Amino acid sequence: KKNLGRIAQIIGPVLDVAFPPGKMPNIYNALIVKGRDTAGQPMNVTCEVQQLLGNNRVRAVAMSATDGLTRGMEVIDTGAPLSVPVGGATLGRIFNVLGEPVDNLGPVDTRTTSPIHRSAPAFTQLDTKLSIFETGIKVVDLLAPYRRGGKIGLFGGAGVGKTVLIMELINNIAKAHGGVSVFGGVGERTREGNDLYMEMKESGVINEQNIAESKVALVYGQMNEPPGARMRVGLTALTMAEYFRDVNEQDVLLFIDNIFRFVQAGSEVSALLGRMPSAVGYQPTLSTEMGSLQERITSTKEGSITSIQAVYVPADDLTDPAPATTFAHLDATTVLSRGLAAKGIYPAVDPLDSTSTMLQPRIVGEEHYEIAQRVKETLQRYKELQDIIAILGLDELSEEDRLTVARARKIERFLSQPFFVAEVFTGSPGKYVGLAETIRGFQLILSGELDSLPEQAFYLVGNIDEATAKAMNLEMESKL
Amino acid sequence: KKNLGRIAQIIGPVLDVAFPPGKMPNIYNALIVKGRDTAGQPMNVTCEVQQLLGNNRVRAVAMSATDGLTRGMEVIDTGAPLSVPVGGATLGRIFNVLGEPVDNLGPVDTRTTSPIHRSAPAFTQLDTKLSIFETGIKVVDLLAPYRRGGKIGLFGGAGVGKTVLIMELINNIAKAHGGVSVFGGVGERTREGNDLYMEMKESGVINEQNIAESKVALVYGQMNEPPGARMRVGLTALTMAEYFRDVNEQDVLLFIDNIFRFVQAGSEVSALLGRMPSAVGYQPTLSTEMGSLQERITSTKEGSITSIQAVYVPADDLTDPAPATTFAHLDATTVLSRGLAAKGIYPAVDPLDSTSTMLQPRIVGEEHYEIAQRVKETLQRYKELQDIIAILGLDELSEEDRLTVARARKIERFLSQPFFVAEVFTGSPGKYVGLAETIRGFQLILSGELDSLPEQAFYLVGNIDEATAKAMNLEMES
Amino acid sequence: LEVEAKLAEGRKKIEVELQEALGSLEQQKEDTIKSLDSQISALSDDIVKKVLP
Amino acid sequence: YKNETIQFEQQKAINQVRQRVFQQALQGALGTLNSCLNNELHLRTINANIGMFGAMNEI
Amino acid sequence: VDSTASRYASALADVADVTGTLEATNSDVEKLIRIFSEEPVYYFFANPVISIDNKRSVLDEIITTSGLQPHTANFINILIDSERINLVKEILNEFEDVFNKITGTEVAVVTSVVKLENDHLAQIAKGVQKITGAKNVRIKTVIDPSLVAGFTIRYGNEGSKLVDMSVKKQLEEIAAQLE
Amino acid sequence: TIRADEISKIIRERIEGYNREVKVVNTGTVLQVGDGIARIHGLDEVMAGELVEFEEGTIGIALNLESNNVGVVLMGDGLMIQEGSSVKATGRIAQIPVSEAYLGRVINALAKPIDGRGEITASESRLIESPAPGIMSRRSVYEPLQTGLIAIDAMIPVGRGQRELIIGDRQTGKTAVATDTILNQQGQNVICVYVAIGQKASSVAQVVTNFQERGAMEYTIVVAETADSPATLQYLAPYTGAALAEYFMYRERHTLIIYDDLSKQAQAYRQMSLLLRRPPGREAYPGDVFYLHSRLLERAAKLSSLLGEGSMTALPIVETQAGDVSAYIPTNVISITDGQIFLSADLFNAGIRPAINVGISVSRVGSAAQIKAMKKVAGKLKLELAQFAELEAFAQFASDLDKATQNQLARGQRLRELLKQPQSAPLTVEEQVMTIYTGTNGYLDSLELDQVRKYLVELRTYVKTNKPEFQEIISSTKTFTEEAEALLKEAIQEQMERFLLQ
Amino acid sequence: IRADEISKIIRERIEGYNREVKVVNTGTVLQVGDGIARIHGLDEVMAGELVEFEEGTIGIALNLESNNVG
Numbered sequence A: 001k002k003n004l005g006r007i008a009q010i011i012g013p014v015l016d017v018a019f020p021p022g023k024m025p026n027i028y029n030a031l032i033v034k035g036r037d038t039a040g041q042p043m044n045v046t047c048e049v050q051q052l053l054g055n056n057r058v059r060a061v062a063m064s065a066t067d068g069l070t071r072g073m074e075v076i077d078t079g080a081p082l083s084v085p086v087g088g089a090t091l092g093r094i095f096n097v098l099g100e101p102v103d104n105l106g107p108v109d110t111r112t113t114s115p116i117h118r119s120a121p122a123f124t125q126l127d128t129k130l131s132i133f134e135t136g137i138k139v140v141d142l143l144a145p146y147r148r149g150g151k152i153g154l155f156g157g158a159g160v161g162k163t164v165l166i167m168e169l170i171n172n173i174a175k176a177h178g179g180v181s182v183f184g185g186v187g188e189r190t191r192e193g194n195d196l197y198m199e200m201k202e203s204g205v206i207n208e209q210n211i212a213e214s215k216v217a218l219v220y221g222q223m224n225e226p227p228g229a230r231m232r233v234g235l236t237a238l239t240m241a242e243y244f245r246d247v248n249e250q251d252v253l254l255f256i257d258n259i260f261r262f263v264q265a266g267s268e269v270s271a272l273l274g275r276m277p278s279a280v281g282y283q284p285t286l287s288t289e290m291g292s293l294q295e296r297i298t299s300t301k302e303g304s305i306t307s308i309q310a311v312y313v314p315a316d317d318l319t320d321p322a323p324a325t326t327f328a329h330l331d332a333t334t335v336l337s338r339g340l341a342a343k344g345i346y347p348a349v350d351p352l353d354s355t356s357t358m359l360q361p362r363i364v365g366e367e368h369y370e371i372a373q374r375v376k377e378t379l380q381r382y383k384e385l386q387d388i389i390a391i392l393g394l395d396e397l398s399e400e401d402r403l404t405v406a407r408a409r410k411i412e413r414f415l416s417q418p419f420f421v422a423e424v425f426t427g428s429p430g431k432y433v434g435l436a437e438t439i440r441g442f443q444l445i446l447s448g449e450l451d452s453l454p455e456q457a458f459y460l461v462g463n464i465d466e467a468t469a470k471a472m473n474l475e476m477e478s479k480l
Numbered sequence B: 001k002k003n004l005g006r007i008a009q010i011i012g013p014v015l016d017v018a019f020p021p022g023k024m025p026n027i028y029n030a031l032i033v034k035g036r037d038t039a040g041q042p043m044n045v046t047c048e049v050q051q052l053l054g055n056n057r058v059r060a061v062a063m064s065a066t067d068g069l070t071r072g073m074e075v076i077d078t079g080a081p082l083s084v085p086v087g088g089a090t091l092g093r094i095f096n097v098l099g100e101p102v103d104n105l106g107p108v109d110t111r112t113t114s115p116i117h118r119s120a121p122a123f124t125q126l127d128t129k130l131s132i133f134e135t136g137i138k139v140v141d142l143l144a145p146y147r148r149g150g151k152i153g154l155f156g157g158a159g160v161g162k163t164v165l166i167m168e169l170i171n172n173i174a175k176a177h178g179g180v181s182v183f184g185g186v187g188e189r190t191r192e193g194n195d196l197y198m199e200m201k202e203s204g205v206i207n208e209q210n211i212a213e214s215k216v217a218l219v220y221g222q223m224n225e226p227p228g229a230r231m232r233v234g235l236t237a238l239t240m241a242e243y244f245r246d247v248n249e250q251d252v253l254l255f256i257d258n259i260f261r262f263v264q265a266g267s268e269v270s271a272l273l274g275r276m277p278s279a280v281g282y283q284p285t286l287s288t289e290m291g292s293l294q295e296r297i298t299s300t301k302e303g304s305i306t307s308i309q310a311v312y313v314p315a316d317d318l319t320d321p322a323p324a325t326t327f328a329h330l331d332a333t334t335v336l337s338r339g340l341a342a343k344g345i346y347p348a349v350d351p352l353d354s355t356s357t358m359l360q361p362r363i364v365g366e367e368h369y370e371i372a373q374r375v376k377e378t379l380q381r382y383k384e385l386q387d388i389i390a391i392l393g394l395d396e397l398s399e400e401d402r403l404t405v406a407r408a409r410k411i412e413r414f415l416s417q418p419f420f421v422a423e424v425f426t427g428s429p430g431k432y433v434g435l436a437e438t439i440r441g442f443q444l445i446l447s448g449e450l451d452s453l454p455e456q457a458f459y460l461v462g463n464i465d466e467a468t469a470k471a472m473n474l475e476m477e478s
Numbered sequence C: 001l002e003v004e005a006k007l008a009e010g011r012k013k014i015e016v017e018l019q020e021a022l023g024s025l026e027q028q029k030e031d032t033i034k035s036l037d038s039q040i041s042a043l044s045d046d047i048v049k050k051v052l053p
Numbered sequence D: 001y002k003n004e005t006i007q008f009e010q011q012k013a014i015n016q017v018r019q020r021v022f023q024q025a026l027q028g029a030l031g032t033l034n035s036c037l038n039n040e041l042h043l044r045t046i047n048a049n050i051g052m053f054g055a056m057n058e059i
Numbered sequence E: 001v002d003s004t005a006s007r008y009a010s011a012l013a014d015v016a017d018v019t020g021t022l023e024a025t026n027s028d029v030e031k032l033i034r035i036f037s038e039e040p041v042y043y044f045f046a047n048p049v050i051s052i053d054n055k056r057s058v059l060d061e062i063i064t065t066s067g068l069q070p071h072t073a074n075f076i077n078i079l080i081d082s083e084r085i086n087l088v089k090e091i092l093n094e095f096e097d098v099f100n101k102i103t104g105t106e107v108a109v110v111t112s113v114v115k116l117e118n119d120h121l122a123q124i125a126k127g128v129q130k131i132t133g134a135k136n137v138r139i140k141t142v143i144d145p146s147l148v149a150g151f152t153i154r155y156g157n158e159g160s161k162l163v164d165m166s167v168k169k170q171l172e173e174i175a176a177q178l179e
Numbered sequence F: 001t002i003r004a005d006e007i008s009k010i011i012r013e014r015i016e017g018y019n020r021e022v023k024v025v026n027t028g029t030v031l032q033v034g035d036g037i038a039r040i041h042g043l044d045e046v047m048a049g050e051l052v053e054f055e056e057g058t059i060g061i062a063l064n065l066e067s068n069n070v071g072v073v074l075m076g077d078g079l080m081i082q083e084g085s086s087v088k089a090t091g092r093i094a095q096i097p098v099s100e101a102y103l104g105r106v107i108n109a110l111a112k113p114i115d116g117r118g119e120i121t122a123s124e125s126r127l128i129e130s131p132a133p134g135i136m137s138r139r140s141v142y143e144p145l146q147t148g149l150i151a152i153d154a155m156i157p158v159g160r161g162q163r164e165l166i167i168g169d170r171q172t173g174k175t176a177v178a179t180d181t182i183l184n185q186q187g188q189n190v191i192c193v194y195v196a197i198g199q200k201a202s203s204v205a206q207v208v209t210n211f212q213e214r215g216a217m218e219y220t221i222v223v224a225e226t227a228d229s230p231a232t233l234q235y236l237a238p239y240t241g242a243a244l245a246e247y248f249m250y251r252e253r254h255t256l257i258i259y260d261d262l263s264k265q266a267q268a269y270r271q272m273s274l275l276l277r278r279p280p281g282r283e284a285y286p287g288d289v290f291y292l293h294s295r296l297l298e299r300a301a302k303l304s305s306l307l308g309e310g311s312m313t314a315l316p317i318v319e320t321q322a323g324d325v326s327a328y329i330p331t332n333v334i335s336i337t338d339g340q341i342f343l344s345a346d347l348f349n350a351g352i353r354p355a356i357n358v359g360i361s362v363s364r365v366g367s368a369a370q371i372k373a374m375k376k377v378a379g380k381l382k383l384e385l386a387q388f389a390e391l392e393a394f395a396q397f398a399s400d401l402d403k404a405t406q407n408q409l410a411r412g413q414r415l416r417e418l419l420k421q422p423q424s425a426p427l428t429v430e431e432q433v434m435t436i437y438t439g440t441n442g443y444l445d446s447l448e449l450d451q452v453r454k455y456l457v458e459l460r461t462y463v464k465t466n467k468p469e470f471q472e473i474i475s476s477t478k479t480f481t482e483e484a485e486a487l488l489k490e491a492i493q494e495q496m497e498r499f500l501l502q
Numbered sequence G: 001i002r003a004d005e006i007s008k009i010i011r012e013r014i015e016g017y018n019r020e021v022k023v024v025n026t027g028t029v030l031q032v033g034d035g036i037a038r039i040h041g042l043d044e045v046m047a048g049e050l051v052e053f054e055e056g057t058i059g060i061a062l063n064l065e066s067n068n069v070g
């Protein structure tokens, strides 16, 4: 803090800070600017030394709003990257990019801090056990089953249900999980930041009576924040999840939502930094900035981190660079389709385009694997036939082709499920479905025992038994 | 004692003119480069200060050919924006960008001149009377009715018939109109301008003798003109039209062919200026340039401008920046299609893409409105059907779908109309169709009383009575 | 119709009332501008004594 | 709404009169200053101005 | 500001500062500015077409008559080698601003219709100093017909910060009434 | 109108009580001026976003603070500005004089009235870029914001503190939907702002006239930046509207703000940044175009009960090119908002007006934004309609389809006929409940589709007149109670019998 | 406006103008950012030659330019 530099430029969020010639901050140090507010009271806006520019000035991207900053103000270099408080006193608090508590409660204890920039675990460390965990979602458990300790991705465009799916997952897994969870919202609506925090209170995860008996830590870098801030709540929320992994040695959930905002935030300031634009307007360092962020989120022998992270896909285009880079990292990708959303099938998880590494018969058993494989062949056939049936009608199909179409149509509806979170969207109370119920339920449809049922007995029911009951009710209604 | 400057740079039509350090001409003032050629000495090069560059140097866009200018010539600030004669003298005359007569007659009175860069009418001065306005065209009077005193847009690519449709509008509307009309040709064929000039004389809009009672002005920056001259022809034409409304307190028609060219000229000069290009090659200030020209056209409490302006749409792409920006300004768009010109339905007005603000039941009455929806509901249904029919063909359709298709086909043909201007192409005489006749005809087709008639009985007739008379001949002939 | 036409005529009457009122106000404003000249003169002297120290 | 027009009118006119009037007063003041004591009053004002500046600096 | 013209001038000042020729170098730099004013002299050095070898010989003769400082003669030779002689004028002007920074002097420029005695200036130059934060103040004077009877001083990094009272009171009064 | 006799008192008043305070003021020199932008030398004390005033009298905004000069974005056109003239640093950063007296006034982007009705009385001031409400500062959206559009208030509900986008093509009906909403808040005690960014001056005037005729101008502010004005003003027009809305929002009032279009804002901000030579992105939009909207639309919130429980519902409007939702600006604004309303020209031409494509329309708040009586009735209505479309499209591919499917094509075609509405024919929430109750429970499964529009209208009138108790239950208890249901049933049967007789 | 005019370098140049010298041995970092260092000096390096900075990082001189080596 003995180094003082004067701001030279403010162009948007990107500052250029001229320092004394020998002593310049390293890259990724936090500058903290002695700026003043509208009251005149000194206000501090943190910056990150992104790059050394020569002529004894750095180029830093400010973590707060640069409106009100003046060329020539004092900038002190803190001599380290952004230290975020970690540990026990971060649990059930809601946090900034900078680690400052944001829930109007008394200040977080800062005896323990940790820098947000660190290297990933070495290749020796990585923990290789393959373990599946139950989520309660019929499309997920059957077809793209999630890996305990593995990176999980929710791919979809705007409005398909990445967020609702994340909420449902959070609710099931979060309460059940022994280990501390961490939600880090990188660039999302503040309404959804509020709707989580008051619903984490209602489920008892925040535990507002006795804080620090809580089991979650919320970090928020929402859409109103500058692009310097949305680049770095991916790292702040990750720094806190690395502490519960590495030091406390307990398994962590890390729900990131959204990962694209983090990628997008860098792109916004990338042009300002002088970097030439890469394909599709992103920064040239996209595959490194994901890798740096992604590599850190991995399970180690000391502890295991399970991260489920929502990924925006711009204009439903899975070839976009931001989405494309992410796919390599994940252990199981859950690709939400707008086609199933507009048909009403919720969650609109595309069963043919969602893959998982764990869906292998050594991992999931040969009973589950054959039914998960035969469901996709029935849906694949139906997809191929869609072009033909519209043009040539249903009657040009063989009995075999018609049977699959009838089955695929029934199967497609069955995958849909009412959630606990989407009771305001569905109108019907949500249902939790085990892995066993799903396999048992899917097997019957595939078997054909349920060929006589109408198709609407399958839409938005949890168990197979519920579908049969719904069919009985529908028949009763029809008689009247 | 006007300050004198020196040319520092000539990059095409963009001049960098250096001035004494205290005195700089303001932005949008005109400059007069003193000029020189081999024989004589013209001051004809006129500029317009666009920027101030520092080191006592403005940057100006020349309104003429810059060929023959030397670095270092004398430049005089005229101290005002480029002023143009307006009024009584501008009736019956063809003018430049610069307000200088073209038609080889006597010079105009420069008693009453006006600057071309004027702020718009303020929000207080506008009016909100919503009146419909008849053009004698079936596609226009029914599905996209035109606004009295508001901007009208004719959209379409090359060769779909914008110029012809405008000529028809000019032909029907101008003689009948009691208000001085002003034509502005921006970036168009000079042949057309010459052709247009003769028509006014033939129909008496431009009477050869006693030219002061002509009640049409003409303003031409054509394709051959340098790009600085095509930017401002629109403004020059607009300035004259605005003066009539403001001082003669009349109702004015302002026909422009083509406002796309005005944007394109602005785009060409922008590259010379060094402004970064925002989208495609378009100048960054596209909305503003378009907006400034468009905003001035509004009708006030003292008079009214009814501008019908054809807008070129490049590569038939309505999502291009120039066409897209224009849509916000217009009160009624008339999107001509190419697929209808390949079939030969003329005017090739795509009846679903064309929209008007006046097609509302409190403006057009409940009768016109309940038909114009029910016409567009049929065509819209037919449009959906086409993907299926393209492969299978007609036979598959249901009986409801087939009935609509038969009706839709008849309806499309009925919209087609022969034009008075288009007699030189086809030879068939044009037909003025009154609005009442058009509404009546459409009701019959929708009702079905005319379901037995063949489809080519409807093609290129004026009334519904004409279709019936035409229908008999096809049947009688055998 | 008849009520509607009556209402339209009432609207015209309102416009006539409103058109006339504005004209009357304009005339009154002109008279005022002509009137209270002393304020103008003395008003001018007004600033002078307070504009500077 | 027509009455609101008059309300505004009464304001614009008022402002105009105020200004024009002030403007004249300004003219007269200028004239008098042009005639007021060159080295005497001029000097006095200079000193005052200087004093004011000094005061400002201190603050 | 950090542009190429500024960058070179700053280097020239830094070498003078090291060797304690800041007064000695500054005189030479002022001496250069008179030399490069002339359109003909500046044009000869600036244009690409004249051979570089010829330029050095002429430059050496110019240096001898001028009697410039040993580094200052180098600095121009460095500019010529590295092609930046087209921006000598910007560089020379830039050096003056840098030279004040090194000393800690600050310029102020004070404006009147009527020439003023040193005593008023002494107060102002002391006043600008405390308000400036200056080690030293150097005062620049100009004569202006337009104000009234006061003046305005300009100071700061640039001549950005101007505090005045002469005309401004009249302007303020004009604004004040309209409120 | 007597002015001259008081001027000698009036002129003296101006000089009277004048402080003449002297303070240090930042000043600098104009290097360049061209097309909306100045490059200012000097001003080493300005702050990023400070208003700087030119010598002629123009207020500009210092966006780029480069190390040599300052990029100033003029709020207007600097025809008058001259190279070498001096510009002052004001100190303020774009405030707005805001008060209670803006209601019913058309106002400028800088907030000075442009209807010519007199100067506004404004005591306080608010910033233009004020920070959004925090995460702890808000509360969940629960109150309804009624549009009177049965297709919105049943399936895409809009709640106070929400941000619903209205997206469609040109002339698809977007403004009409937004305007209808403002007209419909006649006695709901909310304040409405209509920001018109870059919209035609005549068009803005038409909207204002329409509001005035309805009497809606008693609570509406219209902020208008027409196409002719400088890009800066268009760019700042939405912010000014938000600041006005925010002022009411913090006084515990409920506000609704319509921004028409947001697409013409980001064009006006693309123009500003391309002339500042900022490096562009997709379609030459700046990098920070997403941030420009996002920071604006996150102002719209429902505050906690600690901060007065006021709200602010934003209604962006972003028109897409020929159904291209894949374009760069409509991509950015969808993902900000709390659900979109797609309007489509393909449904607009086919009679379905307002042309809500309900399949792609989304409400991210869901049925928390509906009153309970309506939530019970239309809670599963949204999904059923989507499901129904799936087999409407599929039963054109079958020839001999069974009755159990044919029942659903019967009922689903009846449910679509509920949703169509004539322009400016708003429905009370009571009239929406009995309309959705009728269609959902199959009481239209008898009559013809053409008759359905007529039957519902007759039925609603019936229950206004004969049964005012149904009005009383749903307006007070806000719950579709058994008594209310019984009244509705009785009425439905009576109306059906009368309809049968006719 | 261009790299290698850092005003250490210009002054170093003025001091040694009346000289001949080859800086080919060592070259001084001009600017570091985003995984790229620009180096002033290194007149003798060849394209693709590994170069190692202080604190041990190793880099490849992919771009050789008159002003500096990327």
Ligand SMILES: Nc1ncnc2c1ncn2[C@@H]1O[C@H](COP(=O)(O)OP(=O)(O)OP(=O)(O)O)[C@@H](O)[C@H]1O
Residues within 6 Å of the ligand: B356, B357, B358, B359, B360, F168, F169, F170, F171, F172, F173, F174, F175, F176, F177, F319, F353, F354, F355, F421, F422, F423, F424
């Ligand atoms: N519910 C409705 N019923 C009938 N007509 C409607 C309805 N809603 C809108 N319209 C009509 O559609 C036309 C275009 O609507 P509007 O201008 O409101 O849409 P827009 O998308 O704002 O168009 P623009 O792009 O020109 O702004 C209007 O004339 C309006 O009357």
Ligand SMILES: Nc1ncnc2c1ncn2[C@@H]1O[C@H](COP(=O)(O)OP(=O)(O)O)[C@@H](O)[C@H]1O
Residues within 6 Å of the ligand: A156, A157, A158, A159, A160, A161, A162, A163, A164, A165, A346, A347, A417, A418, A419, A422, A425, A426, F362, F363, F364, F365, F366
């Ligand atoms: N399981 C579900 N049931 C009903 N509706 C859903 C479900 N999931 C998503 N939706 C609908 O999708 C809307 C938006 O999805 P959201 O969860 O916000 O995803 P995203 O973050 O991708 O926009 C929700 O508000 C809801 O309307």
Ligand SMILES: Nc1ncnc2c1ncn2[C@@H]1O[C@H](COP(=O)(O)OP(=O)(O)O)[C@@H](O)[C@H]1O
Residues within 6 Å of the ligand: B157, B158, B159, B160, B161, B162, B163, B164, B165, B346, B347, B417, B418, B419, B422, B425, B426
């Ligand atoms: N109403 C019409 N009837 C017959 N032919 C037409 C009509 N309108 C246009 N055409 C044909 O289109 C051709 C060119 O149309 P034109 O108006 O020149 O297009 P543009 O406006 O793009 O120049 C004309 O030569 C004519 O043959």
Ligand SMILES: [Mg+2]
Residues within 6 Å of the ligand: A162, A163, A188, A257, A310
């Ligand atoms: Mg989300």
Ligand SMILES: [Mg+2]
Residues within 6 Å of the ligand: B162, B163, B164
């Ligand atoms: Mg043409």
Ligand SMILES: [Mg+2]
Residues within 6 Å of the ligand: F174, F175, F176
């Ligand atoms: Mg609109």
